[PDB]
Design a binder for this molecule. Structure first.
Ligand code: XYA
Length: 253
């Protein structure tokens, strides 16, 4: 009788029956190896529970270490099996950072992971409120946990009416300053900015930077105006009133 996998080499907190099963269901062998390697290099101390499960990617909690300090991490793992001309194949158009002449359909998830990492770096350097990026390897990206005591921060859509108890008007303005910094100093535009990928603890955080295109992308402008519409739409529901062309101007400067 041969062990099925090397999963028990990972350090997983509260690894009862069901916890193990979850990991054993979502990790493939190649991903397992990558997590093991990150643990041995010192980045991952122990892995915790599932934070998000999704089509393109799953996210888990981990305690780990960056730059000599203890940190709480979000461990984002892209599913390696990918299709069919992803939306994220298209999100590379016009991106000088990445040379198609070098890249093959098989490794395309590695590039998306890479691109998310570098977008977090870029956005952080521009003063955008995003998770601090730590490292990446293969289809695994390690970044700052936005939350407290292993509870992720609510998204704006989770908060809803509650936003009315936190200055919904300052929150909208916080969202708007972040899109402005992203556009003007990072030179990025989120492909689909919404109440689903914005978190809030005591300020806004933009938390899925993989869906962000450079300004040379053919649809940059369109995506920007759509983002502005999404944001006014959602906030208008809570009694913030704002003008499209005046926010678009604020962002575009
Ligand atoms: N950096 C971070 N800190 C804490 N939680 C994070 C996170 N990044 C993502 N999440 C959770 O996973 C999904 C990311 O789009 C979901 O939107 C979100 O629930």
């Amino acid at each position: 009788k041969k062990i099925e996998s090397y999963l028990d080499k990972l350090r997983i907190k509260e690894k009862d029956g069901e916890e193990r099963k979850i990991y054993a269901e979502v990790l493939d062998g190649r991903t397992l190896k990558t997590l093991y390697k990150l643990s041995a290099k010192g980045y991952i101390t122990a892995m915790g529970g599932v934070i998000s499960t999704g089509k393109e990617a799953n996210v888990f909690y981990a305690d780990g270490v960056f730059d000599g300090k203890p940190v709480a991490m979000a461990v984002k793992i892209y599913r390696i099996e990918t299709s069919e001309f992803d939306k994220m194949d298209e999100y590379l158009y016009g991106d000088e950072r990445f040379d198609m002449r070098r890249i093959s359909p098989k490794e395309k998830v590695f590039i998306w992971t890479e691109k998310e990492f570098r977008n977090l770096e870029r956005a952080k350097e521009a003063g955008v409120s995003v998770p601090q990026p730590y490292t990446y390897m293969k289809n695994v990206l390690l970044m700052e946990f936005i939350g407290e005591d292993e509870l992720p921060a609510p998204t704006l859509v989770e908060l809803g009416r509650e936003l009315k108890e936190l200055d919904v008007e300052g929150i909208f303005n916080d969202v708007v300053e972040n899109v402005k910094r992203l556009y003007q100093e990072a030179e990025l535009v989120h492909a689909d900015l919404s109440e689903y990928n914005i978190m809030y603890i005591d300020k806004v955080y933009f938390i899925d930077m993989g869906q962000a295109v450079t300004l040379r992308h053919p649809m940059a402008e369109s995506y920007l105006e759509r983002d502005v519409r999404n944001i006014i739409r959602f906030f208008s529901k809570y009694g913030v009133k704002a003008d499209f062309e005046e926010m678009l101007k604020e962002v575009k400067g």
